[PDB]
C-alpha cells in the first residue's frame, strides 16, 4: 500500500483533467466499451476537480495512523 500512497501523493491533478478531456474528445470523434470508457474519464476528471478546490489530499486514502475508538464505546471491535 505504500507504493500506492507514493502514486497518490505524486499525482498532478491538473494533468489528469487535461489528459482525460483530450482522450474523451478523441473517442467522440470515432460500442459498449467506448461508452464505458467515456464514463470512466468523466468520473476521473470530476474526482480530480474536487481535490483541487478542497483541502482533502488524495494520499489520505492510504492510512498511516489508525484512530482508536474511545473505550466507553467499546465496553468484537
Amino acid at each position: 500500500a505504500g507504493a500506492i500512497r507514493e502514486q497518490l501523493a505524486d499525482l498532478d491533478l491538473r494533468i489528469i483533467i487535461e489528459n482525460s478531456l483530450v482522450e474523451w474528445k478523441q473517442l467522440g470523434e470515432e460500442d459498449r466499451k467506448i461508452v464505458r470508457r467515456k464514463d470512466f474519464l468523466v468520473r476521473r476528471m470530476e474526482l480530480a476537480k474536487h481535490f483541487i478546490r478542497t483541502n482533502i489530499e488524495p494520499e489520505w486514502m492510504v492510512l498511516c495512523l489508525l484512530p482508536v475508538l474511545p473505550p466507553e464505546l467499546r465496553p468484537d471491535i
Binding site: 501523493a9 491533478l13 491538473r14 483533467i17 487535461e18 470523434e29 476537480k49 481535490f51
Partner: protein, 144 residues
C-alpha cells in the same frame, strides 16, 4: 485603448522560452527562435535572481499548487496551450459538424454532399445549407 487602460504586467507575463502573448500562438510552441546568435543563459540566470536565492526554480513538488505562474488566478489552472492554427482548424471542423447534423434532420447529390462533409471532418451544394443558431424568431415559426 479607448478606455486609456494600459496592459497590466500580469497580462505580459513571460514564459520559460522568453515569449509573451505577442508571440506564443505561432506554432513552434514552447520553443525559442534563432536570434542569429547563441543565447546567453548566464545573463538570464543573473537577471532572474540567481545570485541571491530569489530565482524561480522549475522543480516539481508534491502539493496542489501549480508550478506555472500563469496558472495563478484560475480556479483549475489556465487553459491548455492551443495555437492559432489549431484553433482555426477546430473552428473549421465544428461548423461542418453542425452542417452534417442539420443535413441529417431533413438524390445522388445528397449522397455526395454526405460523403464530402464526413471527408472534411459539391462544396457549392454544401454552401446552401443554412444554420439558424440563436435565431429565436425562426425557431418560433417552426414551433408553430
Amino acid at each position: 485603448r479607448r478606455d486609456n487602460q494600459p496592459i497590466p504586467p500580469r497580462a505580459m507575463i513571460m514564459s520559460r522560452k522568453y515569449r509573451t502573448l505577442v508571440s506564443s500562438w505561432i506554432e513552434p510552441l514552447q520553443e525559442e527562435a534563432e536570434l542569429g546568435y547563441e543565447i546567453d543563459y548566464l545573463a538570464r540566470y543573473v537577471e532572474e535572481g540567481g545570485l541571491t536565492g530569489e530565482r524561480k526554480r522549475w522543480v516539481p513538488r508534491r502539493g496542489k499548487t501549480p508550478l506555472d505562474p500563469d496558472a495563478a488566478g484560475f480556479i483549475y489552472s489556465n487553459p491548455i496551450e492551443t495555437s492559432f492554427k489549431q484553433r482555426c482548424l477546430e473552428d473549421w471542423k465544428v461548423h461542418h459538424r453542425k452542417l452534417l447534423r442539420t443535413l441529417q434532420s431533413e438524390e445522388s447529390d445528397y449522397m455526395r454532399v454526405m460523403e464530402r462533409l464526413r471527408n472534411i471532418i459539391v462544396d457549392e451544394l454544401i454552401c446552401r445549407i443554412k444554420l439558424h443558431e440563436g435565431d429565436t424568431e425562426f425557431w418560433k415559426r417552426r414551433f408553430l
